Design a protein around this ligand. Structure first.
Ligand code: CLA
Ligand code: CLA
Ligand code: CLA
Ligand SMILES: CC(C)=CCC/C(C)=C/CC/C(C)=C/CC/C(C)=C/CC/C(C)=C/CC/C(C)=C/CC/C(C)=C/CC/C(C)=C/CC/C(C)=C/CC1=CC(=O)C(C)=C(C)C1=O
Ligand SMILES: CC(C)=CCC/C(C)=C\CC/C(C)=C\CC/C(C)=C\CC/C(C)=C\CC/C(C)=C\CC/C(C)=C\CC/C(C)=C\CC/C(C)=C\CC1=CC(=O)C(C)=C(C)C1=O
Ligand SMILES: CCCCCCCCCCCCCCCCCC(=O)OC[C@H](CO[C@@H]1O[C@H](CO)[C@H](O)[C@H](O)[C@H]1O)OC(=O)CCCCCCCCCCCCCCCCC
Ligand SMILES: CCCCCCCCCCCCCCCCCC(=O)OC[C@H](CO[C@@H]1O[C@H](CO)[C@H](O)[C@H](O)[C@H]1O)OC(=O)CCCCCCCCCCCCCCCCC
Ligand SMILES: CCCCCCCCCCCCCCCC(=O)OC[C@H](CO[C@@H]1O[C@H](CS(=O)(=O)O)[C@@H](O)[C@H](O)[C@H]1O)OC(=O)CCCCCCCCCCCCCCC
Ligand SMILES: CCCCCCCCCCCCCCCC(=O)OC[C@H](CO[C@@H]1O[C@H](CS(=O)(=O)O)[C@@H](O)[C@H](O)[C@H]1O)OC(=O)CCCCCCCCCCCCCCC
Ligand SMILES: CCCCCCCCCCCCCCCC(=O)OC[C@H](COP(=O)(O)OC[C@@H](O)CO)OC(=O)CCCCCCCCCCCCCCC
Ligand code: HEM
Ligand code: OEX
Ligand SMILES: [Cl-]
Ligand SMILES: [Fe+2]
Lengths: 31, 175, 137, 334, 262, 113, 93, 57, 35, 57, 49, 37
């Protein structure tokens, strides 16, 4: 049952990484 | 200091301490930040001269950035997915990582002062006690710690007058 | 303490006579031991056959007893098994087998004397290190 | 105007979110394979007979491990450094018994990080930026090859490579110290200098840049917003930081040149990690750290201990207790 | 593979091909012989090689905690190519009403492991150590069978240490990682006595080799065997499981030279 | 359970050396009055000199609920040597809280931490 | 085996249990290690030391050595855990 | 055993496992890809692909 | 086992050939300073 | 089950033999604990969590 | 393993992909190559694609 | 594995509470940015 928690936490970290890479705030130059 | 490192490992199992883990994370991440920042800045420099050796093409008092933040951002964004876009954030991060590592590891050593040590995982100790075929690298580390303690105590703590015969010293087959 | 003569006096013969090694003798003996037999006999042990070490207990209980200079020196030229019934000159470095053991070719009688002096001097230097092994490193 | 030309343009395109390039062609499949097999073997994999003595060691979460104790166990010592793909096993079950996933993951991952070095070079060429970020990356990769590949080659067994876990990493450390005395080996000391100095210079450089930030922000606003991305002007006063650091120690020590400063920042940790990776590579072939044991003796000639001897006691305890059932002979020559 | 063919191959050809684990056989061309045991001549076995080709384990039919019904099951090998036993040799003597082979040497054991359906691993020591085989005649020929019982030693010896440093001949005599459990004065760690008390227990097995080819020129014979034994017990912690091996056998009978020193 | 006096085979009083706080696991050695090692619980039984079997030891309990009891078998001597390593020997209930046999820290240590 | 009452006779006491003792212990008794101990361990299980002297195939000099060291020798019940490790128990130095 | 969703796999074909067992009780020697584990992994992969398609749309 | 071997050989050869003939397709010209 | 044992009895078998021929699975179905109309709204988990794991008949 | 086959090719089947896939890639690359200006140049690299 | 039982609550809630705090701080801020325009 702890394998459920470990897997969920690792998958959540991977999901945060995915969303940070692909749904980042796009860099743009100010004016 | 090397003897202190191995003593603390053998008697406290300080590698298993999560605060030590956070500290070594801070140290290695700070070295990583130093290396990547140096390489990135030296490799996105603007062409401010006609000499192949580009160190002389910088003036201390210039009010112009000597390297391209935009090009570095593009490089690291399309290589690594994310990249710094703000110099001030970058340089505060370079500060925060090693400092946070040192303070975290300080918490762990303060814990070790009172023998409040993340020595063992009780679940695996009980399972290995009841299951003599259950082996993990954690258990091998515990055996190594026992070896360190028993084979080090006699000469490392001479005031205790530890006389451990060869019978009681924890050993392995052959060596 | 200095390297006094009490440390440097070692048994010479089987009857009980002693001999006081000179500092040159013990220096040469240490160098010769480390160069000619240290590879197997570092620390008074036997790497190839740890059942039989160079500690004084093993040498005294050997047949003939090897806890003296003459007996050790004879072993360096007429090596035998621990019970002294078979010759192991073909498997042990000996001055009579130096062609197949090229380290024993240059040793003279004084060199063998110095090596035996080093062997008998060592146990006086440490209570358990000579022939003790890893446990007393 | 040819299909191959369009394919090459797409591969070498600077418009993809993540650059692929020709090195990425080799990196992405290899790294994805390594990631997939590592995740699958870490969550669920049978115990592995690492030492070749029919004593399996558990490393997977499903077999009673946590994230700290979990690992992909090194290959069996019976295999040695023989190539052990899936097709060289009589069955997949006995492929997993002898730790084949470690070989798969290590090979694919090493190829992938080599591809990462090359891909870092490549993007820079497309960017028009100077090369060498790639050269800095090599130092981390060199260490990874030293621990995962070169140490098995020197010792002659993939069982000797570092386990792909946290507790197994500590085990590999302790056994390496027991067998080689890495702490006294000067290349590891150079690596320790490299990482400690990297942390020191990172903290120092960040502190001085953050300390001399030019006022471009109101009091109810984060100072970081005083910098606008892509601006032409410097975001901090180099003169102020340089003068402060000169007064702190002495004028000559400070790096008045910023490019030299950043070269030094990139140089110190990269050279330190190169040296420690090379040190592990050399101790793979058993050129160990210094052995000052019994180096001080009195006039009689009896050993007066030093800190080297007390360190030797810990090394000896680890040596005797490591792999208790694997050794049948007194010397640990393998 | 015949012995004449093994001599033809060099080590470079045989290495890494799996032919070293394979038991030889007597050729059909060289067969129909009779290895007669002349009186006033002491004979002995040599090169008695046994390759098991099928491994079966007596597994319970259900995971019920009180399951008494068990059926043998097919198994697949985790270990690869270490199963065969080679070089077994022994004196042939008139111990009892007929001839008997006494096992006294050779590789004569293999610490193999198999996995059953469902994923459970059974290690066992396939061995014929201390065998007392009885020939079914006074002469080895096609149809003659040699069979008897043997004593299988423990899979782990006393010097083996468990993951918590406990063994038979050595190791801790307690669960050192639970000092609070040993702190109790009433029972202490008595619950863990079965796992802490490592016991070397020698089990029993039987083998029935049946020789289908025999040659009088070389003294060689070959055939098939079925053997029954018990699996690993982990120094008494586990309950042994019955292992039924079947496979092929090669061997030779020669005259005692006086230098064997049996 | 009282004080476990360790009367050796002749009758000399052995004492189990106490566990220092630093050591998670400490060898069980029974030092003499002057403290030369007399008996111990060996790790390697082969070629054992100071085994309690060879020397011979008996545990006589004085005080407590186990008062006036003289155990003289080697196993029961070893079991109480393991207890005497931890100071005074006590009986424990490990079922009310389902205790797992690993020591904890008092409120003193937790406050300090 | 957390209990083995015949430990003292495994090489640590003045008496040696012949049946399940390693060869190394015979280094303690002069003149018996390489040759006599080999024949002692060859036919290891003995009912008693008398059966050892009758069964061991010793030569006359070997019998003389054994007559010297008779009181240092005994023959208890063979222990399989110790008989298997009678020539090499992993105890080197 | 409270197996809710597995019977729906077993209802229309998927009666085997990669672990070498079957719901019918027989022992599988060479299970195919479309076992319980393979079906589960296929559903997870389809979930990921559908998530990516949702992002694109 | 052989099927997996030939599949892996196919995949490895495919990607290695792509790498090989891609870097051989005038990769040096693919820089922003061309012309 | 009754008709099975009845035709077994008509075949000359006795009660012991006749009932021994009834498979354990069929006898297991003839048990109220297997009834779906015996559980509860908040008695959660496998059916084995209630009466237990059936071992034998 | 450890047999010494050239490129691990123990079965002759393994060669079919190993030789053909480069050949299809070579054929696709040739269409690119034949379109290029293949005369010599005096430069560190070719700027013509 | 004889693991603790409140450790489930500890891990899950110590992950949940900061995570929802961060998500709320992000959503609030965005909402405000949208409302300004
Ligand atoms: C990746 C590997 C790794 C890494 C990166 C670290 C990182 C760390 N370990 Mg280590 N450690 C490791 C593996 C690793 N460890 C292993 C495997 C073990 C087990 C064997 C240990 C055992 C261990 C212990 C036991 C301890 C650490 C500690 C530390 C910290 C040291 C901080 C520091 O810079 O101190 C350097 C010291 C200082 C910064 C103090 C001030 C220094 C002043 C400013 C010096 C001024 C000098 C002056 C100019 C005069 C010079 C004179 C000249 C002649 C020399 C840090 C987090 C320590 C810790 O956690 O502390 C909280 C600690 O006590 N580790
Ligand atoms: C404070 C004390 C201290 C310190 C500062 C260090 C410092 C170091 N030790 Mg340690 N060590 C210590 C104590 C200490 N040690 C003690 C007490 C011992 C004795 C037991 C040892 C024994 C020891 C050994 C035996 C070894 C070290 C090594 C090292 C180095 C590790 C870092 C490295 O090389 O990274 C460099 C970078 C890497 C290794 C990482 C590679 C990164 C790859 C290329 C990419 C990975 C990608 C990833 C998988 C996916 C990304 C995910 C994405 C989503 C972002 C470093 C110099 C190791 C070393 O030098 O290795 C060469 C080593 O082998 N130490
Ligand atoms: C309609 C679809 C459906 C059906 C018929 C079943 C059926 C089953 N599931 Mg379930 N399950 C489902 C969907 C379904 N599941 C889903 C979508 C999930 C993912 C979360 C799960 C996850 C799941 C697990 C993890 C497990 C089961 C198990 C089981 C079995 C026991 C059921 C039980 O104990 O319920 C108990 C139900 C209750 C106590 C509540 C029922 C009454 C109502 C609905 C409560 C509503 C409360 C309401 C929302 C207010 C809450 C307020 C809040 C503030 C607290 C049974 C075969 C067990 C099993 O045997 O697995 C092998 C098991 O361990 N299921
Ligand atoms: C099945 C599975 C998944 C298996 C997993 C099993 C496994 C063992 C799990 C691992 C568990 C794990 C994740 C645990 C980690 C726990 C741990 C110890 C955490 C430490 C946390 C902690 C609080 C530590 C405090 C110290 C701390 C703050 C460290 C942070 C480290 C950190 C992130 C450093 C930065 C690293 C990094 C990669 C930087 C990249 C920066 C980069 C993109 C440069 C960009 C850049 C540079 C320029 O120079 C310029 C100019 C520009 C423009 C520019 O852009
Ligand atoms: C005793 C005692 C005080 C010893 C001091 C030893 C000593 C001379 C240390 C010098 C260390 C060193 C070489 C400094 C450079 C490190 C460095 C990257 C610092 C950051 C930095 C330096 C600058 O010089 C400027 C200008 C800026 C901006 C800046 O970040
Ligand atoms: C935020 C998310 C949380 C939402 C609130 C929770 C919603 C209710 C979910 C049920 C929680 C169960 C509480 C009891 C805990 C427990 O002991 O049981 C935990 C039980 C599982 O039970 C455990 O199962 C294990 C697996 O073998 C072991 O057998 C354990 O012994 C057994 O206790 O959980 C459930 O059974 C989950 C059921 C999921 C709900 C399905 C019900 C059917 C759907 C009807 C559709 C709605 C119609 C209206
Ligand atoms: C680089 C320096 C390291 C030295 C490497 C040795 C070079 C020897 C090459 C032959 C390899 C070999 O025979 O394979 C043999 C081995 C595998 O072959 C093994 O052979 C065994 C018996 O010989 C069995 O058959 C095994 O089943 C089989 O796997 O090759 C591998 O390990 C796989 C090759 C991985 C190649 C990675 C591609 C590298 C990426 C770019 C490649 C460069 C392209 C340049 C284009 C021009
Ligand atoms: C021995 C090698 C000696 C030659 C080095 C040449 C060089 O590095 O020049 C490159 C720059 C040029 O400096 C810069 O040199 C510039 C002049 S020039 O154009 O570079 O000649 C000058 O304007 C500027 O002030 C100066 O800082 O050198 C530096 O700025 C720092 C050099 C530091 C090298 C020693 C540290 C080694 C770390 C090892 C880590 C182990 C852990
Ligand atoms: C995906 C493509 C898989 C094709 C092969 C199908 C197959 O039969 O093997 C399927 C094998 C094991 O099969 C089974 O694996 C069994 C091992 S075990 O029982 O799971 O331990 C094995 O015994 C059995 O013969 C084998 O069929 O399972 C896998 O390896 C698939 C997991 C990896 C998927 C990567 C996806 C990347 C995107
Ligand atoms: C083809 C191969 C592609 C592989 C790509 C993989 C890339 C991996 C992406 C990681 C980034 C994660 C999000 C970081 C957070 C993030 O969104 O940062 C984005 C941030 C952007 O900062 P800006 O400068 O835009 O911010 C200025 C503002 O903050 C104003 O103050 O850039 C960085 O700081 C990233 C540098 C650290 C990058 C390393 C992050 C740590 C990685 C560790 C991940 C944990 C692994 C555990 C798994 C269990
Ligand atoms: C100067 C040269 C050497 C000297 C003086 C020397 C000394 C001795 C002595 C005194 C013994 C007997 C120990 C005892 O009785 O307990 C011995 C035994 C032995 N030595 Fe050496 N030795 C030398 C070189 C070596 C080397 C280099 C090796 C191996 C590489 C070696 C291997 C042996 C062996 C195998 C025995 C035989 C013991 C036996 O079978 O009884 N020795 N040595
Ligand atoms: O396995 Mn890993 O490890 Ca390198 O040493 Mn020899 O073998 Mn074992 O011992 Mn110490
Ligand atoms: Cl070995
Ligand atoms: Fe900067």
């Amino acid at each position: 049952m702890e394998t459920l928690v470990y897997v969920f936490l690792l998958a959540g970290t991977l999901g945060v990484i995915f969303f940070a890479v692909f749904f980042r705030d796009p860099p743009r130059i100010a004016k | 200091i090397f003897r202190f490192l191995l003593f603390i490992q053998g008697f406290h199992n300080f590698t298993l301490n999560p605060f030590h883990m956070m500290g070594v994370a801070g140290i290695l991440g700070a070295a990583l930040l130093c290396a990547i920042h140096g390489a990135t800045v030296q490799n996105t420099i603007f062409e401010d001269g006609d000499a192949a050796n580009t160190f002389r093409a910088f003036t201390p008092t210039q009010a112009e950035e000597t390297y391209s933040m935009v090009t570095a951002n593009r490089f690291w964004s399309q290589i690594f997915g994310v990249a710094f876009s703000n110099k001030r954030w970058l340089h505060f991060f370079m500060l925060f990582v090693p400092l946070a590592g040192l303070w975290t590891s300080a918490i762990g050593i303060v814990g070790l002062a009172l023998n409040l040590r993340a020595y063992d995982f009780v679940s695996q100790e009980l399972r290995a006690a009841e299951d003599p075929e259950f082996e993990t690298f954690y258990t091998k580390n515990i055996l190594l710690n026992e070896g360190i303690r028993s084979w080090m105590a006699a000469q490392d703590q001479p005031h205790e007058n530890f006389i451990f015969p060869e019978e009681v010293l924890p050993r392995g087959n052959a060596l | 303490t200095d390297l006094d003569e009490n440390t440097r006096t070692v048994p010479l013969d089987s009857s009980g006579t002693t001999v006081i090694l000179t500092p040159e003798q013990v220096k040469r003996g240490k160098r010769l031991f480390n160069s000619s037999c240290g590879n197997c006999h570092v620390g008074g042990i036997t790497k190839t056959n740890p059942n039989l070490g160079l500690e004084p207990d093993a040498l005294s209980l050997a047949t003939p007893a090897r806890d003296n200079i003459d007996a050790l020196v004879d072993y360096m030229k007429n090596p035998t098994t621990y019970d002294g019934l078979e010759s192991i000159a073909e498997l042990h470095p000996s001055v009579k087998s130096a062609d197949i053991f090229p380290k024993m070719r240059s040793l003279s009688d004084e060199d063998l004397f110095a090596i035996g002096g080093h062997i008998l001097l060592q146990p006086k230097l440490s209570s358990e290190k000579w022939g003790g092994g890893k446990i007393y490193y | 105007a040819s299909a191959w030309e369009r394919f090459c343009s797409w591969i070498t395109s600077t418009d993809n979110r993540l650059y692929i390039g020709w090195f990425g062609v080799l990196m992405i499949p290899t790294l994805l394979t390594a990631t997939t097999v590592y995740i699958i073997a870490f969550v669920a994999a049978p115990p592995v007979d690492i030492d070749g003595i029919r004593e399996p060691v558990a490393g997977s979460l499903l077999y009673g491990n946590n994230i700290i104790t979990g690992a992909v166990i090194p290959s069996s010592a019976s295999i040695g450094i023989h190539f052990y793909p899936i097709w060289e096993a009589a069955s997949l079950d006995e492929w997993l018994y002898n730790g084949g996933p470690y070989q798969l993951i290590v090979d694919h991952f090493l190829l992938g990080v080599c591809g990462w070095i090359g891909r870092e070079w490549e993007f820079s060429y497309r960017l028009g930026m100077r090369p060498w970020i790639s050269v800095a990356f090599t130092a981390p990769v060199a260490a990874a090859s030293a621990v995962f590949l070169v140490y098995p080659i020197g010792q002659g067994s993939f069982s000797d490579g570092m386990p792909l876990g946290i507790s197994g990493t500590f085990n590999f450390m302790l056994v390496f110290q027991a067998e080689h005395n890495i702490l006294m080996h000067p290349f590891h000391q150079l690596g320790v200098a490299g990482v400690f100095g990297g942390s020191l210079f990172s903290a120092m450089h960040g502190s001085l840049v953050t300390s001399s930030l030019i006022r471009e922000t109101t009091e109810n606003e984060s100072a970081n917003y005083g910098y606008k991305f892509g601006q032409e002007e410097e975001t901090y006063n180099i003169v102020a930081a340089h003068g402060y650091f000169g007064r702190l120690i002495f004028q000559y020590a400070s790096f008045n040149n910023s490019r030299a400063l950043h070269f030094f920042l990139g140089l110190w940790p990269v050279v330190g990690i190169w040296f420690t990776a090379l040190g592990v590579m050399t101790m793979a072939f058993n050129l160990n750290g210094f052995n000052f044991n019994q180096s001080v003796v009195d006039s009689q000639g009896r050993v007066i201990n030093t800190w080297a001897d007390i360190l030797n006691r810990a090394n000896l305890g680890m040596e005797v207790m490591h792999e208790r059932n694997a050794h049948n002979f007194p010397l640990d020559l393998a | 593979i015949t012995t004449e063919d093994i001599r033809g191959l060099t080590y470079s050809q045989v290495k890494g091909t799996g032919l070293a684990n394979r038991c030889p056989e007597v050729s059909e061309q060289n067969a129909g012989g009779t290895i007669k045991f002349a009186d006033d001549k002491k004979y002995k076995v040599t090169e008695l090689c046994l390759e098991p080709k099928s491994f079966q384990i007596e597994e319970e039919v259900t995971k019920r905690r009180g399951e008494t019904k068990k059926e043998f099951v097919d198994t697949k090998l985790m270990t690869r190519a270490t199963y065969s036993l080679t070089g077994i040799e022994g004196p042939i003597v008139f111990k009892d009403g007929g001839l008997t082979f006494l096992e006294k040497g050779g590789i004569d054991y293999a610490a193999t492991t198999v996995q059953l359906p469902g994923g459970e691993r059974v290690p066992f020591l396939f061995t014929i150590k201390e065998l007392e085989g009885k020939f079914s005649s006074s002469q080895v020929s096609a149809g003659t069978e040699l069979g008897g019982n043997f004593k299988t030693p423990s899979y782990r010896t006393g010097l083996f240490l468990d993951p918590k440093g406990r063994g038979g001949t050595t190791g801790y005599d307690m669960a050192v990682a639970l000092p609070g459990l040993e702190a109790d004065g009433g029972e202490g760690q008595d619950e863990l006595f079965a796992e802490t008390n490592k016991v070397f227990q020698v089990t029993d097995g039987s083998i029935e080799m049946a020789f289908n080819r025999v040659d009088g020129t070389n003294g060689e014979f070959s055939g098939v065997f079925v053997s029954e034994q018990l699996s690993d017990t982990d120094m008494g912690s586990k309950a042994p499981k019955k292992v039924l091996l079947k496979g092929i056998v090669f061997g030779k009978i020669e005259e005692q030279t006086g230098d064997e020193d049996y | 359970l009282g004080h476990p006096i360790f009367q050796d085979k002749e009758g000399k009083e052995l004492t189990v050396r106490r566990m220092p706080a630093f050591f998670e696991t400490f060898p069980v050695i029974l030092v003499d009055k002057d403290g030369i090692i007399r008996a111990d619980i060996p790790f390697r039984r082969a070629e054992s000199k100071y085994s309690i079997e060879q020397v011979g030891v008996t545990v006589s309990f004085y005080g407590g609920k186990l008062n006036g009891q003289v155990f003289k078998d080697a196993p029961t001597v070893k079991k109480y040597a393991r207890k005497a390593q931890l100071g005074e020997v006590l009986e424990f209930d490990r079922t009310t809280l389902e205790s797992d046999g690993v020591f904890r820290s008092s409120p003193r240590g937790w406050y300090t931490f | 085996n957390v209990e083995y009452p015949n430990v003292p006779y495994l090489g640590g006491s003045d008496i040696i249990d012949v049946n399940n003792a390693n060869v190394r212990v015979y280094t303690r008794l002069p003149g018996m290690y390489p040759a006599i101990a080999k024949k002692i361990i060859k036919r290891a299980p003995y009912k008693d030391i008398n059966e050892m002297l009758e069964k061991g195939d010793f030569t006359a000099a070997e019998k003389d050595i054994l007559d010297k060291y008779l009181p240092n020798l005994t023959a208890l019940e063979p222990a399989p855990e110790y008989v298997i490790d009678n020539i090499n128990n992993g105890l080197y130095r | 055993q409270g197996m809710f969703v597995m019977p729906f796999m077993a209802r229309i074909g998927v009666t085997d496992s990669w672990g070498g067992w079957s719901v019918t009780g027989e022992s599988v020697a060479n299970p195919g890809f479309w076992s319980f584990e393979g079906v589960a992994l296929a559903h997870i992969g389809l979930s990921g692909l559908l998530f990516l398609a949702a992002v694109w749309h | 086992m052989f099927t997996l071997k030939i599949v892996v050989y196919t995949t490895v050869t495919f990607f290695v050939s792509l790498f090989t003939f891609g870097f051989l397709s005038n990769d040096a010209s693919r820089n922003p300073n061309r012309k | 089950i009754e008709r099975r044992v009845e035709n077994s009895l008509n075949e000359g078998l006795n009660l012991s033999e006749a009932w021994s021929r009834i498979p354990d699975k069929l006898a297991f179905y003839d048990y109220i604990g297997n009834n779906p109309a015996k559980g509860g709204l908040f008695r959660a988990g496998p059916m084995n969590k209630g009466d237990g794991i059936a071992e034998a008949w | 393993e450890g047999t010494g086959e050239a490129l691990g090719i123990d079965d002759t089947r393994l060669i079919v992909p190993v030789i053909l896939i480069p050949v299809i890639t070579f054929i696709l690359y040739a269409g690119f190559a034949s379109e290029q200006d293949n005369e010599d140049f005096f430069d560190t690299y070719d700027q013509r694609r | 594995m004889n693991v603790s039982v409140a450790a489930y609550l500890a891990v899950l809630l110590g992950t949940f509470v900061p995570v929802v705090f961060l998500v709320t701080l992000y959503i609030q801020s965005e909402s405000r940015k949208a409302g300004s325009s």
